[PDB]
């Protein structure tokens, strides 16, 4: 991959470009995702339900185009060619929003003023939805291939600093751009995300000589499908396909097929992990609005509570906790780090159950009204800083489980399908988000009504969020027991 001379400098300019093209591809994803519903409910007039459904369709495309944005990378174009293609759409879609916001050109694109603009928003969102679902499956294996020459020790040290750079785009975008959008303007606010992705396309292209790339091999999939047809239409059942067993196929080819049959059961065991992890991202923010916020205030800053620890725990975990666990033989595998990470998610949901339970006690005595993001909430008279204990326990769960889920998906996939297997990883995380979104509605049915009284921008004091968190912990203690069963069988047969 790299010549002997100058190797050290050739993998610091190949990991500086990949890590500086994920900080800028991410600072332009929270620029559009963060203050979207607020933007649409402006003087010029979507409703509460309509505005959100554009932010739920936009995310749906992001998860559902990863596996198909990976198959395209390992069959036709390759990881480098397809990332440049994706960032072209990502930029092309991102140019609709500045035009829509600007009163000068808003009429031309949206159309005649209603003396709305649904056509330009969806064409803008779909293209951005395609760009972020295909860049997100091809930069993660492409980044870690630069340093793979130095063994698994160097691959792990990459995903530590590839996840500290994605979380440095949340703090930079949810903090900087969000403030500019609400207060300064929306033409300026939505123009920085379009410029940021412009630089990412150029920095990635300019560093074309540092990267080490491999030509696509389309015959990997064509053979793989045939193996399935032969086995299903005719010891694991894939053994027959080998020549040694009388089948008409090679030996190593059948090995790749048997590698996908074993990886898949592990991914299906993480759907309960994502479900009880995207619900704590959403329900926590609802709880914070109902606590005494210290004495406008963008509603985005309430979301970066946990992306300011992952910014200060990874440097600590990458220089003080990793080496200590290395010299001692204590936790080498990657499916043993995930099972540890799924334990702090259990204690985090349970921790927030006690905080909420006492909070409902206070409101019955007295409440203090406050306004956040132009609406009013009946917050309790308890400081928001009581919510630190439930966010630290999530700072330790996005270090053992988010950074070890990527490492396992990459290091346990055939070398001919390393983008279609990170693509699936990010598609089974979508199945996780939408399973939970259905779980919230179920528990909010008239029969149970633990959150029936809740509505858009609605008070939750009448609701009972206390019981909901305990349910998240219960469904997270069950999966932890299950994931140990499947994890043990995977390593045993490995």
């Amino acid at each position, epitope marked *: 991959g790299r010549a002997a001379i100058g190797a050290f400098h050739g993998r610091r300019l190949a990991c500086a470009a990949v890590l500086l093209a994920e900080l800028l591809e991410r600072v332009a994803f929270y620029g559009i995702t963060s203050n979207l519903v607020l933007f649409l409910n402006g003087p010029p007039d979507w409703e509460g339900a309509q505005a959100s459904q554009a932010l739920l369709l936009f995310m749906g495309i992001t998860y559902l185009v990863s596996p198909f944005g990976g198959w395209l990378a390992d069959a036709l174009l390759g990881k480098f060619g397809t990332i440049l293609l994706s960032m072209a759409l990502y930029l092309l879609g991102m140019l609709a929003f500045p035009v829509i916001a600007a009163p000068h050109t808003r009429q031309g694109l949206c159309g005649d003023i209603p003396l709305y603009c649904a056509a330009a928003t969806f064409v803008g969102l779909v293209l951005v939805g395609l760009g972020v679902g295909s860049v997100k499956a091809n930069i993660t294996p492409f980044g870690a291939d630069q340093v793979k020459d130095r063994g698994p020790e160097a691959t792990r040290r990459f995903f530590n600093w590839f996840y500290w750079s994605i979380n440095l785009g949340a703090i930079l975008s949810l903090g900087g751009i969000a403030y500019i959008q609400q207060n300064v303007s929306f033409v300026i606010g939505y123009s920085i995300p379009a410029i940021c992705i412009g630089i990412s396309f150029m920095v990635f292209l300019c560093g074309q000589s540092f990267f080490i790339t491999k030509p696509p091999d389309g*015959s990997a999939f*064509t053979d793989m*499908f*045939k193996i399935l*047809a*032969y086995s299903c*239409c*005719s010891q694991s059942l894939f053994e027959m396909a080998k020549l040694s067993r009388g089948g*008409p196929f090679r030996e190593d080819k059948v090995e790749d097929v048997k590698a996908l049959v074993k990886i898949i059961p592990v991914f299906l065991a993480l759907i309960p992990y994502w479900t009880v992890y995207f619900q704590m991202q959403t329900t926590y923010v609802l709880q914070s609005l109902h606590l005494k916020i210290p004495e406008t205030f963008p509603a985005a800053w309430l979301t970066m509570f946990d992306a300011v620890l992952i910014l200060i725990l990874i440097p600590l975990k990458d220089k003080l906790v990793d080496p200590v666990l290395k010299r001692n033989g204590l936790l080498p595998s990657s499916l043993k780090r995930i099972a540890v990470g799924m334990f702090f998610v259990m204690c985090s949901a349970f921790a927030a159950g006690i905080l909420e339970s006492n909070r409902l006690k206070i409101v019955k005595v007295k409440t203090i009204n406050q306004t956040i993001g132009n609406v009013t909430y009946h917050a309790a008279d308890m400081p928001i800083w009581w919510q630190i204990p439930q966010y630290v326990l999530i700072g330790f769960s996005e270090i053992f489980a988010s950074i070890a889920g990527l490492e396992f998906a990459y290091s346990a996939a055939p070398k001919s399908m390393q983008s279609a297997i990170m693509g699936l990883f990010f598609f089974f995380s979508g199945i996780g988000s939408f399973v939970g979104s259905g779980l919230l509605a179920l528990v909010s049915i008239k029969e149970i009504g633990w959150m029936s009284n809740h509505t858009d921008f609605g008070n939750i004091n009448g609701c009972q969020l206390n019981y909901y968190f305990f349910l998240l912990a219960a469904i997270q203690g069950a999966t932890l027991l299950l994931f140990l069963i499947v994890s043990v069988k995977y390593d045993h047969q490995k």
Partner: nanobody
Framework: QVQLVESGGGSVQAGGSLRLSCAASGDIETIWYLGWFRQAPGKEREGVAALSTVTGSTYYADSVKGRFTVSLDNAKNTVYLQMNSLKPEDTALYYC??????????????????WGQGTQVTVS
């Protein structure tokens, strides 16, 4: 890159039988399906039967079921199309083709890539 050699063409009367064979010269691998297409003069092309080189399943056209048989011979690498109970309506030109993908459609002509010269068969 792949070329098919036809053979066995001929003409017979009503009630006769024939054994058509179309050989191949391209890569034995990289080929998933083989099919036979019958097209009368000045008439739209139509498919007769298809055969898969990995499973062996045969998809005989609904209009010619029960009167034509197709088999594969790996050793000879040349498929055969046995025919019986020939009728004048079968009088037409015949083509053999291969493809790199057939899990979509085994008979639709808009899938096969490589084609052959074809052979004319007349039934009187």
């Amino acid at each position: 890159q792949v070329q098919l050699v036809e053979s066995g063409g001929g003409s017979v009367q009503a009630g006769g039988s024939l054994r058509l064979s179309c050989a191949a010269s391209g890569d034995i691998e990289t080929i998933w399906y083989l099919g036979w297409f019958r097209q009368a003069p000045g008439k739209e092309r139509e498919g007769v039967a298809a055969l898969s080189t990995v499973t062996g399943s045969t998809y005989y056209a609904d209009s010619v079921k029960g009167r034509f048989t197709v088999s594969l011979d790996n050793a000879k690498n040349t498929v055969y199309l046995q025919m019986n109970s020939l009728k004048p309506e079968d009088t037409a030109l015949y083509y053999c083709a291969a493809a790199y993908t057939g899990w979509m459609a085994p008979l639709w002509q808009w899938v096969y890539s490589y084609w052959g010269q074809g052979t004319q068969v007349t039934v009187s």
